Amino acid sequence: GPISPIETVPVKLKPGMDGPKVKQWPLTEEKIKALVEICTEMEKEGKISKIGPENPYNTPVFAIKWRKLVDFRELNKRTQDFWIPHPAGLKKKKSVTVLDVGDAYFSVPLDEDFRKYTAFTIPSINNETPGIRYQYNVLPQGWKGSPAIFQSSMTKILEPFKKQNPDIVIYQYMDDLYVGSDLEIGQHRTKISELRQHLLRWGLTTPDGYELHPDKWGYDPSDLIAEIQKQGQGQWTYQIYQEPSKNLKTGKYARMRGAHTNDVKQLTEAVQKITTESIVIWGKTPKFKLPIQKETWETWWTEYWQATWIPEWEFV
Ligand SMILES: O=[N+]([O-])c1cc([N+](=O)[O-])c(O)c([N+](=O)[O-])c1
Ligand SMILES: O=[N+]([O-])c1cc([N+](=O)[O-])c(O)c([N+](=O)[O-])c1
Ligand SMILES: O=[N+]([O-])c1cc([N+](=O)[O-])c(O)c([N+](=O)[O-])c1
């Protein structure tokens, strides 16, 4: 749908910070084609615009039906802060459905003076020739500012559902809603559908959600660390903690060998599951320590990464 110019909100970088300049890594010809197709459609719809030679910023993109993912980590660090509470009962619910509500953002303009800092490049084959440069004209998915700016509209949209379903907990984290109830699974799913239809009535398309059942699964609100380690061979272990001695949670996953898997793919799965669990339990995304070289991770992680968010991580 079309945007409303009066919903443009002024935004800026943190004092004395410039915009991001993180280079586009090489992509496969398949991924480049997909990005060209996606970006040609976004441009036709006014959501991005080609930029000229003056703009010096850059944020990396990649492709994962294909979807474009932007790694806004550096822009997010440089973006101003914005002036939710996590329900302790969300993890006690029989079911929690996660819904991606990032589609909302395409309908909301981005401050024209901030657009330049969202510049990105569709790379050429092997990065041999200059790529195709674009910036965002609307709130971008994965950008810190987008859920903050949309919160007032999200609240107005959710209000009738919340008023009619007091037994349902709705917690928002970044670009997702976590919808929790103790209903029979069929009844819970019906409430999810009613919620998706409400969102859609207001122009918010959502993917099918993914279902958690966390009642089958000393925190200090002031950073979370998740460490994954190799346990011999054959399985993975992880520790979630803030101070080194006391763990808050520990767990295991299998480290399987096969023609369709590898350590990076499995580690990305584990990162996504530990993150989701951490958001549910504590409302925080951990920083990760992964049992792999940075070079091998930096090489391959984008090949399997299905999340719209991207956490911070260290290595051996
Ligand atoms: O990847 N990059 O960071 C990047 C950046 C610029 N630039 O103007 O700041 C480019 O012109 C290109 N380029 O044209 O391929 C790439
Ligand atoms: O397409 N590209 O994103 C691209 C990227 C880079 N770079 O170093 O990141 C280049 O140097 C060139 N290049 O040299 O044309 C192109
Ligand atoms: O291909 N290029 O012409 C090119 C140009 C610029 N630039 O800022 O003028 C870059 O930053 C990059 N880059 O960072 O890859 C590439």
> What's the rounded Cα separation, in Å, for the pair 9 and 274?
34
Ligand 1, residue 23: give the atom nearest the CA.
3
126 and 189 in a common domain: no
> What's the rounded Cα separation, in Å, for the pair 219 and 247?
10
| Residues flanking ligand 1, CB < 6 Å | 23-24, 56, 58, 121, 130-131, 133
> What's the rounded Cα separation, in Å, for the pair 132 and 200?
33
68 and 95 in a common domain: no
Sign for the pseudo-dihedral over CA of 234, 211, 200, 160: negative
Instruction: Specify whether the CB–CB gap between 79 and 110 falls below 8 A.
Output: no
User: How far apart are the CA of 59 and the centre of ligand 2, in A?
Assistant: 13
Kind plus residue range of the DSSP H or E element containing 179: strand 176-181
CATH, residue 54: 3.10.10.10
Ligand 2, residue 26: give the atom nearest the CA.
3
> What's the rounded Cα separation, in Å, for the pair 223 and 235?
27
- Domain encompassing residue 75: 5-83+106-136
> What's the rounded Cα separation, in Å, for the pair 311 and 175?
14
Q: Give, using CA atoms, the residue closest to atom 16 of ligand 1.
A: 121
129 and 10 in a common domain: yes
> What's the rounded Cα separation, in Å, for the pair 117 and 133?
12
Pocket probe for ligand 1: among 24, 75, 125, the residue whose CB has the most ligand atoms within 8 Å is 24
DSSP labels, 142-160 = T-THHHHHHHHHHHHHHHH
Q: Give, using CA atoms, the residue closest to atom 4 of ligand 1.
A: 23
307 and 185 in a common domain: no
Q: Give, using CA atoms, the residue closest to atom 5 of ligand 3.
A: 130
Kind plus residue range of the DSSP H or E element containing 264: helix 263-282
> What's the rounded Cα separation, in Å, for the pair 126 and 146?
32
> What's the rounded Cα separation, in Å, for the pair 314 and 42?
34
| Residues flanking ligand 2, CB < 6 Å | 23-24, 121, 123-124, 127-131
Ligand 1, residue 24: give the atom nearest the CA.
1
- Nearest alpha carbon to residue 21 among 128, 109, 113, 116: 116
Instruction: Specify whether the CB–CB gap between 228 and 250 falls below 8 A.
Output: no
161 and 171 in a common domain: yes
Residue at a domain's end among 169, 185, 216: 216
> What's the rounded Cα separation, in Å, for the pair 114 and 72?
14
Structure tokens at 239: 């520790």
Instruction: Specify whether the CB–CB gap between 287 and 274 falls below 8 A.
Output: no
Q: How many domains does the chain have?
A: 3
Pocket probe for ligand 3: among 23, 24, 122, the residue whose CB has the most ligand atoms within 8 Å is 23
> What's the rounded Cα separation, in Å, for the pair 64 and 104?
20
Structure tokens at 265: 């793919």
294 and 176 in a common domain: no
283 and 253 in a common domain: yes
List, in order, residues 6 or more apart from 253 with CB less than 8 Å away: 235, 236, 237, 238, 266, 269, 270, 273
Neighbours of 38 (CB within 10 A): 17
Q: Give, using CA atoms, the residue closest to atom 10 of ligand 2.
A: 127
Q: Give, using CA atoms, the residue closest to atom 6 of ligand 2.
A: 127
Residue at a domain's end among 173, 188, 216: 216
| Residues flanking ligand 3, CB < 6 Å | 23, 56, 130
List, in order, residues 6 or more apart from 44 with CB less than 8 Å away: none
List, in order, residues 6 or more apart from 216 with CB less than 8 Å away: none
**Beta partners for 62?**
69
257 and 158 in a common domain: no
206 and 113 in a common domain: no
Q: Give, using CA atoms, the residue closest to atom 10 of ligand 3.
A: 56
Ligand 3, residue 124: give the atom nearest the CA.
1
> What's the rounded Cα separation, in Å, for the pair 89 and 78?
34
Ligand 3, residue 23: give the atom nearest the CA.
14
- Nearest alpha carbon to residue 270 among 308, 226, 312: 226
201 and 116 in a common domain: no
125 and 16 in a common domain: yes
125 and 30 in a common domain: yes
CATH, residue 281: 3.30.70.270
Neighbours of 199 (CB within 10 A): 21
